[PDB]
Structures are given as structure tokens and as C-alpha cells.
Swiss-Prot record:
It comes from the Eukaryota. Component of some HBO1 complex composed of KAT7/HBO1, MEAF6, ING4 and BRD1/BRPF2. Component of the MOZ/MORF complex composed at least of ING5, KAT6A, KAT6B, MEAF6 and one of BRPF1, BRD1/BRPF2 and BRPF3. Interacts (via PHD-type zinc finger domain) with unmodified histone H3. Interacts (via PWWP domain) with dimethylated and trimethylated 'Lys-79' on histone H3. Highly expressed in testis. It comes from Homo sapiens. There is a cross-link at K41 (Glycyl lysine isopeptide (Lys-Gly) (interchain with G-Cter in SUMO2)). It is found in: Nucleus; Chromosome. This is Bromodomain-containing protein 1. Residues 9-113 form the Bromo domain.
Length: 121
């Protein structure tokens, strides 16, 4: 139908906006601490600690499948990256500190994305 096409165009355009959001967020992680899944070879007990792992590569796979229906779902995944790290790692670690800086700096990017999504429908 013409309605299914129009909806598909909306999802395509959301995906395009979320791809730019993801790029901006990932620039706030220049050390690439959150780029890839925590290795279960190198941290074999990770899943005993963290029940829903997340990372930027995994978000990019979901994005390119148009697997984010709205900004809320995308933010949920970004928040898991931060929140998983801040639980698994102690406060006095490079990992925890990197998460705090990503959270703080990403808030700015996400604040305006929420406006662009409400604005452009």
C-alpha cells in the first residue's frame, strides 16, 4: 500500500538520523572502550554479572537492519552500554571513568536528537 511505503520512508529517515546520532556518540569514546562486545574469551564470567550486554557495534547492526522503531529504543541501548560498565567496573577505573564522560557528553547530543525527532515527526 501507499501507507506502508510512507511508513517505510519515515523509518528510513529515522535510521538516517540515528546513524548520525550514533556517530556523534561514538566520537565521545575516542579510546574505543565501548566499540565492541566485552569478550567472553577474555572475561569468561561476564554474563554472570551483566545480563544484557551492549556495545556500539551491536547497536550499529540493529540500526542497519532498521531495528530501532523510535529514539527511546535507541537510547535504551546506549544507556545499557553506560550502565553495564558502571556496574561491572569500580569507580576508580579507566573503564568507569570513560563511561561517565560518555554519559555526560552524550546527554547534549541526545537532548537535541529528541527535539529533531519530535520536530520532524
Amino acid at each position: 500500500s501507499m501507507e506502508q511505503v510512507a511508513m517505510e520512508l519515515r523509518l528510513t529517515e529515522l535510521t538516517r538520523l540515528l546513524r548520525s546520532v550514533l556517530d556523534q556518540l561514538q566520537d565521545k569514546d575516542p579510546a574505543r572502550i565501548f566499540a565492541q562486545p566485552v569478550s567472553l574469551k577474555e572475561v569468561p564470567d561476564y554474563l554472570d554479572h551483566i545480563k544484557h550486554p551492549m556495545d556500539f557495534a551491536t547497536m550499529r547492526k540493529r540500526l542497519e537492519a532498521q531495528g530501532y522503531k523510535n529514539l527511546h529504543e535507541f537510547e535504551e541501548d546506549f544507556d545499557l552500554i553506560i550502565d553495564n560498565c558502571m556496574k561491572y567496573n569500580a569507580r576508580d577505573t579507566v573503564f568507569y571513568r570513560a563511561a561517565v564522560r560518555l554519559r555526560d557528553q552524550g546527554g547534549v547530543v541526545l537532548r537535541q536528537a529528541r527535539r529533531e525527532v519530535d520536530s520532524i515527526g
